[PDB]
Design a protein around this ligand. Structure first.
Ligand SMILES: [Ca+2]
Ligand SMILES: [Ca+2]
Ligand SMILES: [Zn+2]
Ligand SMILES: [Zn+2]
Lengths: 237, 237
């Protein structure tokens, strides 16, 4: 299986597999059984403002999720990405639905890494700022049943029957270019993101959650990940 | 023939095909016969600092090269990047030699595009800063006989014959990810570069020049390019 680390914005409560009793933010290390969880308000179709940092000088993997006039979902778990995730990786978005409906529309996504030639020897980058996901964006390897375009949006669902998001569908948004990590040139790459989303209510008690993974450079939708496995993990342990 | 726009840092006069009697910085629009040239000093084994911009607030395609304690060769030619070059490109580096030897070591490279999602509203980017070319740099699509690693260097010659780099060698260094240009969301894509090279004196009239192109998304070595075709042109037209 592909070694994969995500920050799950899960919306279906799974006290079966370690998701808490409430719709939560979660931080996954090679398992859907997460490390930290936090209560999240989860307003309806509104805007998005999520954020991820991992500064190896502080070695925390923090995150927030902010609506307007809401609060931050601090889910900072202490994990070292030295040994738990491969040398060259492939960041991207993951979304899913199953037996319910919920909207998985991304409106903008960004990134910035800064990785240590010899710390003050002019660290590298892979910054990008996709605010305007177009129709034929050919630097994305969107897998699954994910689509793009039709507005400035990233529609990570089979959609548009009045947007009614067509349950049991999986969508991924793998970015095209790799990122050097392992430690090896040490791992101070404070890789930032911004994860603006719009989880609109279909009036259905909406629940299956969006993610933000960091996979291996080779991946797929492994053997069925529609549902509580949430788009990227093969196994529920 | 792939559509390609390059900045020849030509270290050899090619009077048969329009290169001037002096070694020169150049500029190319689907042509090894350059639009505009300027005198370049072409020092021995030293370092580097080149820089290429195209801001459509002024629509000038500029290029400057400066050693430390040397001058700058502004070779700016107004050309309309609207129609002369496709929507999606694959930028990179190109260097070659033939019947005379020269070292074409690149030791750092950057790029920074900024194209108008909606002019104020948070334009896109592709900033990277490769100061630490590794032995197994898997985000380069280095073609031909390009080598890398063994130091912090990008050796675009078959090298290590005591730095006498095995004449009629050629090697390209295409970056891994595409860039949106054509117009469509108009063409303020102020792509930057920083192109610190090293051209070692072989005691052999160092010659055949390094390039920096903006090609088609599909490319290779065109029909043999060890020489006047400078690594990226099929024909002398
Ligand atoms: Ca769930
Ligand atoms: Ca030439
Ligand atoms: Zn969860
Ligand atoms: Zn020339």
């Amino acid at each position: 299986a592909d070694t994969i680390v995500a920050v799950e914005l899960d919306t279906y409560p799974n006290t079966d597999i370690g998701d808490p009793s409430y719709p939560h933010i979660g931080i996954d290390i090679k398992s859907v059984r997460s490390k930290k969880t936090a209560k999240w308000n989860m307003q309806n179709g509104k805007v998005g403002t999520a954020h991820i940092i991992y500064n190896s000088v502080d070695k925390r993997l923090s995150a927030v999720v902010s609506y307007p006039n809401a609060d931050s979902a601090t889910v900072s778990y202490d994990v070292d990405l030295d040994n738990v995730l491969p040398e060259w990786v492939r960041v991207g978005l993951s979304a899913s639905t199953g037996l319910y409906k919920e909207t998985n529309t991304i409106l903008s996504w960004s990134f910035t890494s800064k990785l240590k030639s010899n710390s003050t020897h002019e660290t590298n980058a892979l910054h990008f700022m996709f605010n305007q996901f177009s129709k034929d964006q050919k630097d994305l390897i969107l897998q699954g049943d994910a689509t793009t375009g039709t507005d400035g949006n990233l529609e990570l669902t089979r959609v548009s029957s009045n947007g009614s998001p067509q349950g049991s569908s999986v969508g991924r948004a793998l970015f095209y270019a790799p990122v050097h990590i392992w430690e090896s040139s040490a791992v101070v790459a404070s890789f930032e993101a911004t994860f603006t989303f719009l989880i609109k209510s279909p009036d259905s008690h909406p629940a299956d959650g969006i993610a933000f993974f960091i996979s291996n450079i080779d991946s797929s939708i492994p053997s069925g990940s529609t549902g509580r496995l949430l788009g990227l993990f093969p196994d529920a342990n």
